[PDB]
Design an enzyme around this catalytic site. Structure first.
Site: not given
Ligand SMILES: CC1(COc2ccc3c(c2)ncn3-c2ccc3cccc(N4CCC(N)CC4)c3n2)COC1
Length: 296
Positions: A31-33, A35-37, A39, A157, A161-162, A175
């Site tokens: 779902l993402g990558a 500085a936070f690591g 996900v 933060d 985006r968060n 986050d």
């Molecule tokens: C649109 C779709 C869905 O996307 C997603 C993305 C993240 C999703 C998600 C569904 N449910 C949860 N989380 C999370 C959970 C913890 C996170 C802890 C740290 C960082 C995160 N992320 C999101 C925002 C940040 N700016 C970048 C990294 C995190 N995300 C359906 O397929 C992708």
């Protein structure tokens, strides 16, 4: 007197009521990558049949201090408790391998990309995006942030985006890697050396590395500008440079987005007061938005 102290949630033991076996956790897509690591989406079999969750983890190359910070974030989330408008902790894997933090999954992803996708179909008045949705989003983020502040926590933060969107148009702050409990000092002085979200930061955070309830409120005001501009990047036409800092310090502030109600731009302006003591609290912001919703 000195027999009383503030309990530091990051000093408390990890509570094994959160522990979940990693051999019942199957990873899906990333779902993402950053500085936070990293996900990922995952299935956690039997955590409640199979529920879809998000799992946060570090890179395999992570430093010992990065690993301790993920454990600290787990403890902060454990102490914070549950709220409708945060991405809640559901579980953890803390032995037999690297730490995994299991949280709620939000199927629509982050609000910034959602807004940017729905920009062209937005119509102020009547599924499609409307002014009513944007006010609801402003209200829900304020409620989540009021909850954090009621627990003496700062996020540090806050930005579109968060903010994640799940079913029923419910928004959830996510986050918590930088979130801090500030009961002892009523502020936090960042000693880190990471890249920082400069255009969302209060001037006292940029200039003096100080973070407070009031600097989160500043960032909320920037979030409101992103929201009612339907996902525009803040301070258009301005690189982060000496000119930018000089202008912010002198009193420059962004003008209202076209579709922001005047009373919402009013909130933005108070969030950006140079004097942190003159900014509203999230409690006050919630009450203000509530009344706007009711009057609509
Ligand atoms: C649109 C779709 C869905 O996307 C997603 C993305 C993240 C999703 C998600 C569904 N449910 C949860 N989380 C999370 C959970 C913890 C996170 C802890 C740290 C960082 C995160 N992320 C999101 C925002 C940040 N700016 C970048 C990294 C995190 N995300 C359906 O397929 C992708």
């Amino acid at each position: 007197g000195n027999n009383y102290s503030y309990i530091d949630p990051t000093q408390l033991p990890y509570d094994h009521k959160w522990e979940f076996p990693r051999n019942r956790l199957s990873f899906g897509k990333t779902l993402g990558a950053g500085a936070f690591g990293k996900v990922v989406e995952a299935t956690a079999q039997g955590l409640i049949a199979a529920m879809t969750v998000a799992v946060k983890m570090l890179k395999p190359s992570a430093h010992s201090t990065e690993r301790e910070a993920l454990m600290s974030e787990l403890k902060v989330l454990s102490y914070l408790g549950n709220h409708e408008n945060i991405v809640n902790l559901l579980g953890a894997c803390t032995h037999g391998g690297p730490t995994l933090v299991i949280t709620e999954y939000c199927c629509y992803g982050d609000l910034l990309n959602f807004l940017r996708r729905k920009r062209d179909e937005f119509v102020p008045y009547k599924d499609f995006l409307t002014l009513e949705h944007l006010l609801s989003f402003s209200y829900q983020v304020a409620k989540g942030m009021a909850f954090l502040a009621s627990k003496n926590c700062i996020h540090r933060d806050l930005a579109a985006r968060n903010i994640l969107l799940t079913h029923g148009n419910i928004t959830k702050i996510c986050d918590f890697g930088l979130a801090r409990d500030i009961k002892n000092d009523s502020n936090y002085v960042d000693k880190g050396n990471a890249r920082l979200p400069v255009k969302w930061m209060a001037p006292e955070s940029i200039f003096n590395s100080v973070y407070t309830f009031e600097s989160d409120v500043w960032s909320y005001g920037i979030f409101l500008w992103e929201l009612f501009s339907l996902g525009s990047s803040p301070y258009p036409g301005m690189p982060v440079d000496s000119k930018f800092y000089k202008m912010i310090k002198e009193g420059f502030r962004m003008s209202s987005p076209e579709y922001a109600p005047a009373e919402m731009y009013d909130i933005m302006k108070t969030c950006w007061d140079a004097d942190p003591d003159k900014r509203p609290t999230f409690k006050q912001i919630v009450q203000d938005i509530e009344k706007q919703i009711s009057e609509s």
